[PDB]
Design a protein around this nucleic acid. Structure first.
Lengths: 92, 96, 96, 92
DNA sequence: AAAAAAAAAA
DNA sequence: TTTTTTTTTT
């Protein structure tokens, strides 16, 4: 039963909002809005992403195109999404 | 593919950055903010920087009514006396 | 949820299997069929097997009248002198 | 506009009838009646299914309960339903 | 009719 | 992990 941002928002481990997702890589700050459907809006361009890993690999490739590869890079209100994946596996 | 943000509204030149251009009117209270080129907002009173219209709106309204719950603050924020949500609507039509 | 078939009629014991039990009378001509426990029909003349009373009814009527167009054969088929459609109605009554 | 047995029947790709739909799985032969509304009646039990997939997963789970999973399994007068799906996409 | 939740497969 | 598409539900 693979864990998605949709499960988390539904099972209330997360709350949707503007500029609640962030990535720091080699000096560039990326900020993301979380929609109720769990899709991510990159503020800078408004381009929509389906998964943390989609958004993270797009952003990191802009800074270092050699970077081949989500839940460890993307933070939600100061904490990594993995801790929110973990939290859910413990509740369910 | 693409959703509206303050930064998308700045790139399409639908909005212009500057001092006191943003405003909220809530229960006889007026809050004014500055719009930055990077789409972030500065609340004039504290000089505090917010990352969203929501985040600034939820914060200001919490100071006048402490039982004010979180939600989308595009509906309550004006740019030069007109509703942000109209700039969103203008962009959505502009780019069908 | 549920709809009538020869097999549902067999389960509810509304029909008994056997030789010669089925019959069609079309333009002064008679055809007879055996009803199997699996609900398939055997045409006595050729020993040919059909999935439904329809399939059998259109095949037999097309030999006496090559125009006759396809459709539901329940209306035309008799089980021991009574219309198969009466066994359908008697089942629907019992169940609903 | 996703293709259903109703569309095929309505657009005359399929003809409704008794014992016109069939499945063969591990020795069990299943036979279906196609209704004008595009719903499937399973001859053996008279139980009514809304989709080829609903009928196929039900019948097969009876043979092999570890089979989790329509248009490839269910045949119409000797050919697979997917061929009638493909035919409609060309005709429309 | 739309809106949203699910089994392989790379 | 994610990316895919039919179907049930309304």
């Amino acid at each position: 039963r693979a864990v998605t941002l949709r499960v988390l928002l539904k099972d209330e481990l997360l709350e949707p909002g503007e500029g609640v997702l962030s990535i720091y890589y080699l000096g560039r700050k990326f900020t993301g809005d979380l929609q109720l459907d769990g899709r991510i809006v990159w503020q800078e361009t408004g381009q929509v992403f389906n998964s943390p890993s989609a958004w993270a690999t797009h952003c990191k490739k802009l800074v270092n195109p050699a970077k081949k590869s989500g839940w460890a890079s993307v933070k939600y209100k100061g904490q990594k999404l993995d801790k929110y994946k973990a939290a859910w596996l413990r509740r369910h």
